[PDB]
Amino acid sequence: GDRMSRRLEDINKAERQRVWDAMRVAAAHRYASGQMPAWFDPEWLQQEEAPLNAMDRMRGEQRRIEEQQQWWREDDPYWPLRDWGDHPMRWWTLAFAAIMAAGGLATSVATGYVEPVQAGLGAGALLALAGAAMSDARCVPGALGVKLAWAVCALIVLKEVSVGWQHKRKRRLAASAPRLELTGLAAAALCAGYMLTDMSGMGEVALPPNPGAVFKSPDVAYRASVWQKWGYGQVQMRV
Amino acid sequence: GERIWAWRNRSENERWFWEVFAWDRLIFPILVIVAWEYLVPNHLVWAVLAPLALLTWMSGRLPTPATPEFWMLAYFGFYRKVWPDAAAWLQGYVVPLMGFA
């Protein structure tokens, strides 16, 4: 049909891509440790697509473009919604890092307490590093950056709403209760912004599979491996 | 019915965890060891040696430093019942057998 042809084309495309990526990784490893046959050019590891799929795409696209042609910026106003290559929440992260650092140092000089500057400059360092890594979102560091920033903002929100700050003690007891103010609110807004833009990388890190997930799997070797790891290596597989 | 079918195909690990693993292999042994060490005077036959035999008989395998039973027994039993007096015994009778005062 013209329906099973589409399925077949997509299967071939995906398989060619997966194989190219596995080659790139294994070649990077074999090269970093000497064993490579010296006609090898280490620039071939920057070609992301695949040679075959790239050629198909190029030919199809040129056929299309051939047979079909038988602040404020007035020229293009929607420049912010354009794929520039970084994470959307990248300048906000650096802005918040600068605010945290400045406020922490100012407070700890104006009063005499040593926790404000330590927390402020620690968070500032971590958030500047995350906002540096977030300047190329396709890489692996581009995703670990987002994860690091989310962790730091969550910890800030936690310290604010559950333990409070040392320089905010009062004489009373309900006057000095840990509540959410403006720093915790900004950190919460940042966490929501990371979650609702993109934080989906490194999804293969989780808790390992159970014997409950492989009960119905079609693989005997895999099921045996999982049972072995969880302590059931001697049970009988009447399957 | 359709919603239940969809949810059951996405929740196999958690189903096995809550049905086969939560109590029997996570909470019950912890509770059992802590409760045994709460009673049972600060001896050694009772804090370390007899639990070893009974755990070996119950679980079917001798606990070695690779298994959490050994470390739970070690910490609770030894470090909180047998250490605070063996420490005095050693600090009184075996350090004078060395140079340090």
Binding site: - | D24, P29, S59
Partner: peptide, 24 residues
């Protein structure tokens, strides 16, 4: 090749339960 997990401890007998009320 194993994980770091307890073993079942009640596949043989039932005596262990006797510690949960008493301690309680």
């Amino acid at each position: 090749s194993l994980y770091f997990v307890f073993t079942q401890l009640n596949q043989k007998t039932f005596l262990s339960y006797w510690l949960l009320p008493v301690a309680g």
